[PDB]
Design an enzyme around this catalytic site. Structure first.
Site, PDB file in Angstrom:
ATOM      1  N   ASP A  23      -5.404   1.590 -18.860  1.00 27.17           N
ATOM      2  CA  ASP A  23      -4.089   1.188 -19.355  1.00 27.17           C
ATOM      3  C   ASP A  23      -4.232   0.078 -20.385  1.00 27.17           C
ATOM      4  O   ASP A  23      -3.566   0.095 -21.409  1.00 27.17           O
ATOM      5  CB  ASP A  23      -3.191   0.696 -18.206  1.00 27.17           C
ATOM      6  CG  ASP A  23      -3.041   1.723 -17.090  1.00 27.17           C
ATOM      7  OD1 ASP A  23      -4.061   2.314 -16.671  1.00 27.17           O
ATOM      8  OD2 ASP A  23      -1.886   1.939 -16.628  1.00 27.17           O
ATOM      9  N   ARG A  47       5.172  -1.635  -7.525  1.00 29.11           N
ATOM     10  CA  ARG A  47       4.760  -0.940  -6.304  1.00 29.11           C
ATOM     11  C   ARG A  47       3.513  -1.552  -5.663  1.00 29.11           C
ATOM     12  O   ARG A  47       3.017  -2.598  -6.118  1.00 29.11           O
ATOM     13  CB  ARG A  47       4.582   0.562  -6.588  1.00 29.11           C
ATOM     14  CG  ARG A  47       3.375   0.878  -7.453  1.00 29.11           C
ATOM     15  CD  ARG A  47       3.131   2.382  -7.491  1.00 29.11           C
ATOM     16  NE  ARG A  47       2.094   2.756  -8.460  1.00 29.11           N
ATOM     17  CZ  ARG A  47       2.287   3.593  -9.480  1.00 29.11           C
ATOM     18  NH1 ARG A  47       3.492   4.134  -9.704  1.00 29.11           N
ATOM     19  NH2 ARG A  47       1.287   3.880 -10.296  1.00 29.11           N
ATOM     20  N   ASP A  48       2.997  -0.907  -4.615  1.00 30.45           N
ATOM     21  CA  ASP A  48       1.773  -1.366  -3.933  1.00 30.45           C
ATOM     22  C   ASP A  48       0.494  -1.040  -4.706  1.00 30.45           C
ATOM     23  O   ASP A  48      -0.388  -0.315  -4.216  1.00 30.45           O
ATOM     24  CB  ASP A  48       1.692  -0.790  -2.519  1.00 30.45           C
ATOM     25  CG  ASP A  48       1.730   0.738  -2.498  1.00 30.45           C
ATOM     26  OD1 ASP A  48       1.844   1.377  -3.587  1.00 30.45           O
ATOM     27  OD2 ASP A  48       1.645   1.295  -1.369  1.00 30.45           O
ATOM     28  N   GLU A  49       0.400  -1.565  -5.927  1.00 33.27           N
ATOM     29  CA  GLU A  49      -0.767  -1.321  -6.762  1.00 33.27           C
ATOM     30  C   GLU A  49      -1.067  -2.624  -7.509  1.00 33.27           C
ATOM     31  O   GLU A  49      -1.666  -3.514  -6.931  1.00 33.27           O
ATOM     32  CB  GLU A  49      -0.540  -0.115  -7.685  1.00 33.27           C
ATOM     33  CG  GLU A  49      -1.829   0.421  -8.289  1.00 33.27           C
ATOM     34  CD  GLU A  49      -1.794   1.914  -8.603  1.00 33.27           C
ATOM     35  OE1 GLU A  49      -0.769   2.589  -8.336  1.00 33.27           O
ATOM     36  OE2 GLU A  49      -2.833   2.416  -9.084  1.00 33.27           O
ATOM     37  N   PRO A  81      -7.405  10.538  21.844  1.00 40.57           N
ATOM     38  CA  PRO A  81      -7.234   9.237  22.533  1.00 40.57           C
ATOM     39  C   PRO A  81      -5.789   8.759  22.565  1.00 40.57           C
ATOM     40  O   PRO A  81      -5.020   9.047  21.652  1.00 40.57           O
ATOM     41  CB  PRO A  81      -8.113   8.275  21.726  1.00 40.57           C
ATOM     42  CG  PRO A  81      -9.050   9.147  20.941  1.00 40.57           C
ATOM     43  CD  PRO A  81      -8.325  10.438  20.694  1.00 40.57           C
ATOM     44  N   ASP A 132      -1.342  -2.359 -14.175  1.00 41.84           N
ATOM     45  CA  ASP A 132      -0.708  -1.073 -14.435  1.00 41.84           C
ATOM     46  C   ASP A 132       0.798  -1.129 -14.172  1.00 41.84           C
ATOM     47  O   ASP A 132       1.587  -0.672 -14.986  1.00 41.84           O
ATOM     48  CB  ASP A 132      -1.353   0.025 -13.593  1.00 41.84           C
ATOM     49  CG  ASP A 132      -1.243  -0.219 -12.072  1.00 41.84           C
ATOM     50  OD1 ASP A 132      -1.363  -1.344 -11.563  1.00 41.84           O
ATOM     51  OD2 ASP A 132      -1.042   0.766 -11.371  1.00 41.84           O
ATOM     52  N   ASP A 143      -1.489   3.716  20.332  1.00 40.42           N
ATOM     53  CA  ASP A 143      -2.011   4.986  19.895  1.00 40.42           C
ATOM     54  C   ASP A 143      -1.219   6.046  20.684  1.00 40.42           C
ATOM     55  O   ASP A 143      -1.546   6.298  21.850  1.00 40.42           O
ATOM     56  CB  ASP A 143      -3.514   5.042  20.233  1.00 40.42           C
ATOM     57  CG  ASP A 143      -4.159   6.343  19.828  1.00 40.42           C
ATOM     58  OD1 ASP A 143      -3.425   7.282  19.479  1.00 40.42           O
ATOM     59  OD2 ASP A 143      -5.407   6.430  19.842  1.00 40.42           O
ATOM     60  N   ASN A 144      -0.192   6.683  20.097  1.00 39.64           N
ATOM     61  CA  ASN A 144       0.187   6.575  18.680  1.00 39.64           C
ATOM     62  C   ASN A 144       1.469   5.818  18.351  1.00 39.64           C
ATOM     63  O   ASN A 144       1.559   5.197  17.282  1.00 39.64           O
ATOM     64  CB  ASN A 144       0.268   7.985  18.060  1.00 39.64           C
ATOM     65  CG  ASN A 144      -1.096   8.598  17.883  1.00 39.64           C
ATOM     66  OD1 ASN A 144      -1.538   9.421  18.699  1.00 39.64           O
ATOM     67  ND2 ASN A 144      -1.805   8.162  16.843  1.00 39.64           N
ATOM     68  N   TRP A 160     -11.575   4.758 -19.489  1.00 35.22           N
ATOM     69  CA  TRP A 160     -11.243   3.707 -18.534  1.00 35.22           C
ATOM     70  C   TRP A 160     -12.310   2.609 -18.696  1.00 35.22           C
ATOM     71  O   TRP A 160     -12.037   1.603 -19.336  1.00 35.22           O
ATOM     72  CB  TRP A 160     -11.097   4.271 -17.090  1.00 35.22           C
ATOM     73  CG  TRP A 160      -9.647   4.655 -16.798  1.00 35.22           C
ATOM     74  CD1 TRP A 160      -8.798   4.019 -15.936  1.00 35.22           C
ATOM     75  CD2 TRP A 160      -8.880   5.702 -17.414  1.00 35.22           C
ATOM     76  NE1 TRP A 160      -7.561   4.613 -15.959  1.00 35.22           N
ATOM     77  CE2 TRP A 160      -7.581   5.645 -16.865  1.00 35.22           C
ATOM     78  CE3 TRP A 160      -9.176   6.709 -18.352  1.00 35.22           C
ATOM     79  CZ2 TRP A 160      -6.570   6.534 -17.242  1.00 35.22           C
ATOM     80  CZ3 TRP A 160      -8.167   7.598 -18.727  1.00 35.22           C
ATOM     81  CH2 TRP A 160      -6.881   7.501 -18.172  1.00 35.22           C
ATOM     82  N   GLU A 164       6.089   4.803 -16.545  1.00 32.82           N
ATOM     83  CA  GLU A 164       4.775   5.394 -16.312  1.00 32.82           C
ATOM     84  C   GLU A 164       4.708   6.842 -16.833  1.00 32.82           C
ATOM     85  O   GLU A 164       3.665   7.281 -17.354  1.00 32.82           O
ATOM     86  CB  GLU A 164       4.447   5.350 -14.823  1.00 32.82           C
ATOM     87  CG  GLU A 164       3.079   5.895 -14.423  1.00 32.82           C
ATOM     88  CD  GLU A 164       2.806   5.708 -12.931  1.00 32.82           C
ATOM     89  OE1 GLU A 164       3.786   5.606 -12.143  1.00 32.82           O
ATOM     90  OE2 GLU A 164       1.613   5.656 -12.546  1.00 32.82           O
TER      91      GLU A 164
HETATM   92  C1  LIG Z   1      -5.382   6.458 -13.617  1.00 31.92           C
HETATM   93  C2  LIG Z   1      -4.441   5.359 -13.109  1.00 31.92           C
HETATM   94  O1  LIG Z   1      -3.465   5.925 -12.237  1.00 31.92           O
HETATM   95  C3  LIG Z   1      -2.376   5.135 -11.778  1.00 31.92           C
HETATM   96  O2  LIG Z   1      -2.453   5.167 -10.348  1.00 31.92           O
HETATM   97  C4  LIG Z   1      -2.417   3.691 -12.309  1.00 31.92           C
HETATM   98  O3  LIG Z   1      -1.139   3.063 -12.023  1.00 31.92           O
HETATM   99  C5  LIG Z   1      -2.819   3.633 -13.801  1.00 31.92           C
HETATM  100  O4  LIG Z   1      -1.676   3.739 -14.638  1.00 31.92           O
HETATM  101  C6  LIG Z   1      -3.720   4.779 -14.294  1.00 31.92           C
HETATM  102  O5  LIG Z   1      -4.701   4.353 -15.265  1.00 31.92           O
HETATM  103  C1  LIG Z   2      -8.010   6.787  17.705  1.00 32.00           C
HETATM  104  C2  LIG Z   2      -7.391   8.008  17.022  1.00 32.00           C
HETATM  105  O1  LIG Z   2      -7.356   7.743  15.598  1.00 32.00           O
HETATM  106  C3  LIG Z   2      -6.716   8.701  14.734  1.00 32.00           C
HETATM  107  O2  LIG Z   2      -7.522   9.888  14.664  1.00 32.00           O
HETATM  108  C4  LIG Z   2      -5.316   9.070  15.228  1.00 32.00           C
HETATM  109  O3  LIG Z   2      -4.477   7.933  14.999  1.00 32.00           O
HETATM  110  C5  LIG Z   2      -5.357   9.438  16.723  1.00 32.00           C
HETATM  111  O4  LIG Z   2      -4.086   9.776  17.307  1.00 32.00           O
HETATM  112  C6  LIG Z   2      -5.986   8.330  17.554  1.00 32.00           C
HETATM  113  O5  LIG Z   2      -5.939   8.803  18.922  1.00 32.00           O
HETATM  114 CA   LIG Z   3      -3.829   9.567  19.639  1.00 31.42          CA
END
Ligand SMILES: C[C@@H]1O[C@@H](O)[C@H](O)[C@H](O)[C@H]1O
Ligand SMILES: C[C@@H]1O[C@@H](O)[C@H](O)[C@H](O)[C@H]1O
Ligand SMILES: [Ca+2]
Ligand SMILES: C[C@@H]1O[C@@H](O)[C@H](O)[C@H](O)[C@H]1O
Ligand SMILES: C[C@@H]1O[C@@H](O)[C@H](O)[C@H](O)[C@H]1O
Ligand SMILES: C[C@@H]1O[C@@H](O)[C@H](O)[C@H](O)[C@H]1O
Ligand code: NA
Ligand code: NA
Ligand code: NA
EC number: 3.2.1.40
Length: 1029
Positions: A641, A632-634, A231, A628, A177-178, A693, A893
């Protein structure tokens, strides 16, 4: 005569491990003679193929009925683990019988948790948990109470430690931290950066430091910075593995610390820190604001068991298996089956899907070995934007091998406490982050008997929450469907090679590589490139999609990931020994094992590409759940969709099993007060009760019914639909819904009021519920009445006397016309206004996710097919043609995922593989191919090709449940010819455009009327021809 071709059970030939009490049988029929109908059928079921002559399970007798699709088994109760053979014959309209169909079979699985005696097992703690921070302390400079508040400053720390002899391994787990930068004997081994910090203290890093540690005195040095007043503290454990045992060094008060920037050389062993005060413990691990922080491990461990079987003749062997996580099983040196990412994603609290494999030919007399890789998957790995451990902390395996012998005896081998585990070569495996494999860590022979596993560890009984149900897999398992060889290699930066597969695909690669043991090749995956030819990954957000392979130095090595998948057209290769060629990387395309069901070709290359892109966007997002985006991270089961895309999906692939499975997921997630969630399976607390949806719970069952005639999907959905309508009515005022939700997502600067959208979808769901009740022979009056009341409220609130709709957007008119909300007197005016808005945008659409699928159909319905074609053939932004000219191979998209200036839209949200805008597909298939359902499941087909735009020629084949429906037409020298094939036991209504309807020549059928400039014909099955000269 009439013959049965390709009979199926639950949409497939020869299902194995099917637990349905009343499996549904289908018999497509073929005849060279036109006009055939079924008058009757007879089904037999027996315990052997030969036994069908005197069947011992069921004989339906001759049943008077024209039903030939999804006819439920109606004999005596089926038993577990049993193969059932079956045959059907039919009688035609003249009462002549067909041959009995060539015998087929289905096989039941375990039919419920009670038939399992296997136990859930996991690799033990040394193999599943990362080095832990327990026993360590958060430390800081001695100033105030750092766990409460410290200045926004950097502090410096040193420790010299005397390490033991014979070190074989060394790992550093560290968090701050941090932020921190840590060195050993003056060499930096790890750091985190302030400008990238988002509560990074929650996620300790684990670093192999064997290359920097030695016996005797080692100097550790750490700088740490606090980002703001509040902190501060950092924590670590250095774990040294030796010939003796384990030795741990902690962050604690034996460290020296300073609050003044030291002279350079402060990281070096011989630097003088004798004037530095001792570091202060800010909090023991588990105390302070930070809680029980732990690094995340994601190994795919090896589990195995050897056992002896008798020396007897085997009649059958089956492996039943599943995992909380992912698994791949092996038996006697051979991989079991060809599934990827088994068992798939369900809400594991409620259900987990199990697989059944035929392993008769793999089992041996005497010594046998059963083995599996077990990985985190969706159960324990990173999921969406939400991090790991969604359902549990570590993966578990359940396996039951049943061997039946010719003498009637059997043996059962199960997962249990006697199994053994090792790390093996898959160091890390995550769906989003990628897989890390070290070939030097392979244990050759582990999937075969006679293997030395004395130094492997005993498995543990899994501490995982037990799923409520263990259910036979419903959807087609994910399998490799195609390979894509690299089409070229570029080197845009020295030693950084980019290989182009030519198609944005989903799956993972095969890498071929030769070189020295310990060489590490890194594979990054991207949907698109930068202008300089380097890969662009910013749109992947937190998903690394990186696979790492370390060589063992044995010839032309082959690496194929198992427990990850990526969405990509381009692969960046670094650390390759020498220069890769096109043979070095091959894409392995993975998706649900379901057939493609629509062939489509026109004289227009751009439309042919559009169709290809649609089928690629679909398959890329049909891996266990309809996603969807695959990249990516989804990668979540987004209801909106799939709502919009389902009708198109059901043309291009057999999507019945896939979306049946998904609807179970959707109903598993429905809230106690009846709200369908925004995503299913429900993860990440995304929300619920959103118009367009949650309505997927109504619109998707209806789309499946229309395409397949599947009545069971309606019966299974109607109660959840009732609960949804109750929820919606409660959350409305005079039946008007709030202006909440996503709305017409990603429209082109033409935002439709969300209350118009919400109330419209509420009405539409009531309408569909009434239609479902009607189809199922239930009382439809309450739903019809509800629809009537909502439509009246809608018209009063949002529709003006001149037919203008609130918001005056393209989508406003599209939705109200599509859902039959415009008063009939005002449909003309509403459609005229739509055309006017399109004209005013220079013949471009403005519609987002909700408007787009209904746009071209509404235009055609209101007599503006010419406008539809103008939009379809449009090439400038925004349009379908615009991305195609930019080299799209999937649907994006956004209409401007690449902007007109050549730049990318924002990486905060910008996918190049969303199927939503591929919803144009259904319009092409219905109106250019001329293939649409007149009755549900194509019992009647409406054949109405509408030549127009640039289209002068088209051919299509749809693989319906009744068999192929084909069309071929051509405009040439003033004339028109259409040929079509309509399968036995269905009929068609054929529309042939003509200046003089009564002049249309036709081999079969009856002219019934002239309408809309066409001769209309009613015709039975067969091969037909229509000619206008
Ligand atoms: C509302 C929503 O939004 C995006 O984040 C998704 O990838 C999806 O396509 C859509 O339905
Ligand atoms: C514990 C606390 O958590 C969040 O608010 C931030 O990462 C901050 O810097 C850390 O000190
Ligand atoms: Ca901190
Ligand atoms: C333990 C050892 O002692 C001295 O040689 C110095 O203090 C040196 O930097 C330290 O590493
Ligand atoms: C584009 C097309 O898509 C599917 O029909 C199949 O994968 C086929 O092999 C491919 O050519
Ligand atoms: C699967 C998991 O289940 C619970 O912990 C919560 O609902 C969370 O949001 C979800 O991601
Ligand atoms: Na199966
Ligand atoms: Na039927
Ligand atoms: Na010193």
């Amino acid at each position: 005569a009439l013959r049965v071709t390709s009979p199926s059970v639950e949409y497939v030939q020869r299902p194995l491990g099917l637990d349905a009490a009343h499996p549904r049988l289908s018999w497509p029929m073929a005849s060279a003679a036109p006009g055939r109908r079924q008058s009757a059928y007879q089904v037999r079921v027996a315990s052997s193929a030969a036994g069908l002559s005197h069947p011992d399970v069921w004989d339906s007798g001759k049943v008077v009925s024209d039903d030939s699709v999804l006819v439920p088994y109606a004999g005596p109760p089926l038993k577990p683990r049993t193969r059932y053979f079956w045959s059907v014959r039919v009688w035609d309209a003249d009462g002549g019988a067909s041959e009995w169909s060539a015998p087929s079979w289905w096989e039941t699985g375990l039919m419920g948790a009670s038939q399992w005696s296997a136990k859930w097992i996991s690799a033990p703690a040394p193999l599943t948990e990362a080095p832990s921070l327990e026993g360590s302390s958060w430390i800081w400079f001695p100033e105030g109470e750092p766990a409460n508040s410290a200045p926004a400053a950097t502090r410096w720390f040193r420790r010299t430690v005397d390490l033991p002899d014979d070190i074989t391994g060394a790992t550093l787990a560290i968090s701050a931290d941090n932020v921190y930068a840590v060195s050993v004997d003056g060499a930096e081994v790890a750091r985190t950066d302030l400008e990238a910090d988002n509560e990074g203290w929650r996620r300790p890093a684990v670093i192999d430091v064997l290359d920097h540690v030695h016996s005797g005195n080692n100097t550790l040095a750490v700088s740490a910075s606090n980002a703001s007043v509040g902190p501060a503290g950092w924590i670590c454990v250095l774990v040294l593995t030796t010939a003796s045992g384990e030795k741990k060094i902690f962050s604690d008060a034996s460290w020296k610390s300073t609050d003044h920037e030291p002279a350079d050389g402060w990281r070096e062993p011989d630097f003088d820190d004798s004037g530095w005060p001792a570091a202060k413990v800010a909090a023991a691990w588990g105390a302070g604001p930070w809680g029980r922080v732990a690094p995340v491990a994601s190994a795919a461990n090896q589990l195995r068991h050897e056992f002896r079987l008798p020396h007897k003749k085997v009649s059958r062997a089956r492996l039943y298996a599943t995992a909380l996580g992912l698994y791949e099983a092996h038996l006697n040196g051979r991989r079991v089956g060809r599934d990827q990412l088994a068992p798939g994603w369900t809400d594991y609290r409620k259900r987990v899907q199990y697989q059944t494999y035929d392993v008769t030919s793999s089992v041996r007399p005497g010594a046998n070995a059963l083995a599996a890789y077990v990985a985190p998957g969706w159960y324990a790995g990173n999921v969406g934007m939400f991090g790991p451990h969604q359902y549990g902390e570590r993966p578990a395996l359940l396996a039951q091998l049943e061997v039946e012998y010719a003498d009637g005896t059997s043996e059962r081998i199960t997962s249990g406490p006697d199994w053994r585990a090792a790390s093996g070569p898959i160091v890390s495996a995550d769906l989003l982050s990628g897989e890390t494999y070290d070939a030097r860590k392979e244990t050759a022979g582990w999937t075969s008997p006679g293997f030395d596993d004395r130094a492997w560890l005993a498995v543990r009984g899994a501490d995982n929450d037990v799923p409520e149900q263990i259910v036979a897999q419903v959807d087609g398992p994910v399998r490799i469907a195609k390979e894509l060889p690299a089409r070229k290699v570029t080197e845009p930066k020295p030693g950084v090679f980019v290989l182009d597969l030519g198609q944005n695909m989903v799956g993972s690669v095969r890498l071929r590589v030769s070189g020295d043991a310990g060489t590490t090749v890194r594979l990054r995956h991207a949907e698109v490139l930068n202008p300089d030819g380097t890969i662009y990954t910013a749109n992947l957000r937190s998903a690394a999609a990186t696979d790492t392979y370390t060589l063992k130095g044995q010839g032309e090595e082959t690496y194929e990931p198992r427990f990850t998948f990526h969405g990509f057209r381009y692969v960046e290769v670094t650390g390759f020994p020498g220069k890769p060629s096109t043979t070095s990387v091959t894409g392995r395309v993975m998706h649900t094992s379901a057939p493609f069901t629509f062939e489509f070709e026109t004289n227009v290359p751009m439309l042919n590409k559009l169709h290809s892109n649609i089928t690629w966007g679909q398959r890329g997002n049909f891996l266990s759940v309809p996603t969807d985006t695959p990249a990516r991270d989804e990668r979540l089961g987004w209801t909106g969709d799939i709502n919009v895309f389902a009708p198109t999906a059901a043309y291009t692939m057999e999507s019945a099993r896939f979306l049946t499975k998904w609807l179970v997921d959707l109903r598993d997630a429905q809230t106690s007060d009846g709200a369908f969630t925004d995503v299913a399976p429900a993860v990440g607390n995304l929300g619920n009760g959103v118009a367009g949806w949650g309505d997927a719970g109504v619109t998707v069952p209806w789309a499946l019914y229309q395409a397949y005639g599947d009545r069971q999907v309606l019966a299974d959905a109607l109660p959840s639909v009732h609960a949804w309508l109750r929820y919606l009515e409660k959350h409305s005022d005079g039946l008007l819904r709030p202006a909440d939700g996503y709305g017409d997502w990603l429209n082109v600067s033409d935002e439709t009021p969300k209350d118009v959208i919400a109330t419209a979808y509420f009405a539409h769901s009531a309408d569909l519920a009434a239609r479902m009740a009607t189809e199922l022979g239930k009382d439809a009056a309450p739903y019809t009445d509800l629809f009537t009341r909502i439509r009246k409220a809608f018209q009063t609130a949002y529709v003006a006397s001149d037919g203008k709709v609130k918001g005056d957007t393209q989508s406003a008119y599209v939705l109200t016309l599509s859902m039959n909300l415009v008063p009939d007197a005002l449909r003309k005016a509403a459609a005229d206004r739509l055309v006017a808005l399109i004209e005013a945008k220079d013949w471009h659409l403005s519609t987002g996710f909700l408007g787009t699928p209904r746009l071209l159909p509404v235009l055609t319905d209101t007599g503006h097919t010419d406008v539809a074609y103008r939009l379809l053939h449009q090439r400038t932004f925004p349009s379908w043609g615009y991305p195609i000219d930019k080299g799209s191979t999937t649907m994006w998209e956004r209409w401007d995922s690449i902007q007109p200036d050549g730049g990318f839209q924002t990486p905060e949200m910008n996918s190049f593989n969303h199927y939503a805008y591929g919803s144009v597909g259904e319009w092409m298939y219905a109106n250019i191919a001329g293939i649409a359902p007149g009755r549900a499941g194509y019992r009647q087909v409406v054949i109405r090709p509408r030549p127009g735009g640039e289209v002068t020629s088209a051919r299509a084949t749809f693989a319906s449940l009744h068999g192929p429906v084909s069309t071929r037409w051509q405009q040439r020298s003033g004339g028109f010819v259409l040929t079509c094939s309509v399968p036995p036991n269905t009929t068609a209504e054929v529309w042939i455009p003509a200046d003089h309807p009564d002049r249309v020549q036709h081999t079969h059928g009856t002219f019934v009327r002239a309408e809309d400039g066409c001769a209309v014909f009613e015709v039975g099955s067969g091969s037909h021809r229509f000619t206008v000269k």
